[PDB]
Amino acid sequence: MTNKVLTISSYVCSGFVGNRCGMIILDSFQIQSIFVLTTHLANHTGYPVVGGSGVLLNDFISIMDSLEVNHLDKDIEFLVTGYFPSSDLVYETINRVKRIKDNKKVYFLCDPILGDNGKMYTKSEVQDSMKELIKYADIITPNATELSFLTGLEVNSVSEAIKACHILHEQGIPVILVTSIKEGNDIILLCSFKDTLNNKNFTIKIPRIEGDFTGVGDTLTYILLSWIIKGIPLEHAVNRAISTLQTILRNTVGTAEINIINCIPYLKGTEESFTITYI
Amino acid sequence: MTNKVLTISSYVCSGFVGNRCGMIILDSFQIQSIFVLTTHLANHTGYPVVGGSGVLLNDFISIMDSLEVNHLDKDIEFLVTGYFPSSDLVYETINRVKRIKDNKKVYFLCDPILGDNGKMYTKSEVQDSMKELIKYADIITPNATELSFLTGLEVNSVSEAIKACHILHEQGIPVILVTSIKEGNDIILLCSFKDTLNNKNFTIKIPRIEGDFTGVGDTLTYILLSWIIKGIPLEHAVNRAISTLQTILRNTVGTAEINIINCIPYLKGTEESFTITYILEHHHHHH
Ligand SMILES: Nc1ncnc2c1ncn2[C@@H]1O[C@H](COP(=O)(O)OP(=O)(O)O)[C@@H](O)[C@H]1O
Ligand SMILES: Nc1ncnc2c1ncn2[C@@H]1O[C@H](COP(=O)(O)OP(=O)(O)O)[C@@H](O)[C@H]1O
Ligand SMILES: [Mg+2]
Ligand SMILES: [Mg+2]
């Protein structure tokens, strides 16, 4: 019994975002993981009141130190970061990431959680610190808004997303999965590679289901990562992840919370319902 | 999509105790639940270093108020409490329990987490506050040590457990599941009812597996509750829970952490491998 994944992200007592999505998904795939929380909130930030607090830097340090000293993180092969409430935790996480990647190969999926629909959810300080964190990632999974905040570019189309991805590839980021770009009544996902010699950029066109959903990007991150962990090539891992997500959303009533608990039996679905379209 | 369970207990980032056990188990049974944390620790207290902190009262209140204002707790039918690091959180929980039980029937399983092997985990302040919290429970699930701390009586045998259960039943507690009493190389579980006219007290004898395990009582609590939620009579819920736990332990290699992740497919097991033994009520017939 060794921990294979370390995931650092938010926690909500009720509903499904961040590490709570991560727990549900990684537990269902039976991938032994460490879940370090960055918040302890009653519910997600979409509600009118959001009780509870961000995790304090000293407690985060204490936790990370304890995992190291007790050798509980020695065998980590995969790292995920999500939501941070404050930049101090982001800068500390950068120090930890550098250390974790020094003694072994560790695949780091950075899921920057900053906003949606052109608006910032997160405390504004976080943005700049996230621009630094992403530089250590093997893959990043922003939505279009987040891509815009990480580059300063408008991202209102695939072409604009391509240009913004270039900026980040030039900083060294090998892979960028832009999880949603509005195109009419479809959502386009774009997968862009720094190394186009050995990888083919692609899009996937997803018909929009009515509603603005919360935790969908987090759910994608963890289903995707789970399949990557299970040895599935990236193209297929993405297609499975988006396909399973369509199933979850078709079975979700309202938009406050995704129906992930009831859908646990279908999380390991292998249906690849979409076409991989090469640019 | 409504939250059916509210569970208030500890959290570890790595390994399996308290609400982390609860998440794994209740998620696997697809029982939509609220998991309010009372700690955020790196790992359980068994390790040489235990990083992180207890949840502060003001944050706990902020969380509980937010659940209420956003109407996320309106449909709760089941309540579980586990580990508390400090008495302030216990007294506040009592307030929340009373409120939650005022507008609807809510089944409250109180799992007092105080200690084991005759020794205390908790600050002495917590014990006294737990003596008040248990009075609101429909069922409690202490080990023998915890029963002794809640009553001030020694509990070294089934007869002793019966005498200590009396004290708590006289305070109004309807059901007491004493999860472990040492008897040779067996563990005896005792289920004791305040109302012995309409319920039958029983024991189950469990062969000890070598090791002192962490999170086992927590795991029992959430498997038992899940089957109660699914409508299984208590006797059968207990037998399934103890049976599933033996399977987990037989398949656990260390004693550091129970093998619950690999055992997720067996958590909804319906095998009832032990014998329910009905006993004579009165302490003087035993032990
Ligand atoms: N309204 C919707 N209709 C269909 N699919 C959706 C919808 N919202 C999200 N998704 C799916 O969820 C994935 C992630 O959603 P997205 O909104 O990009 O994440 P975030 O939560 O970061 O904003 C998308 O790639 C898509 O597969
Ligand atoms: N060493 C062991 N061998 C076999 N079963 C055990 C052992 N430890 C615990 N159990 C099982 O787990 C259940 C709960 O254990 P217990 O020690 O009472 O919980 P805790 O002390 O964590 O509150 C017991 O009723 C028993 O079925
Ligand atoms: Mg979105
Ligand atoms: Mg994302």
Ligand SMILES: [Mg+2]
């Ligand atoms: Mg014990």
Ligand SMILES: [Mg+2]
């Ligand atoms: Mg117990």
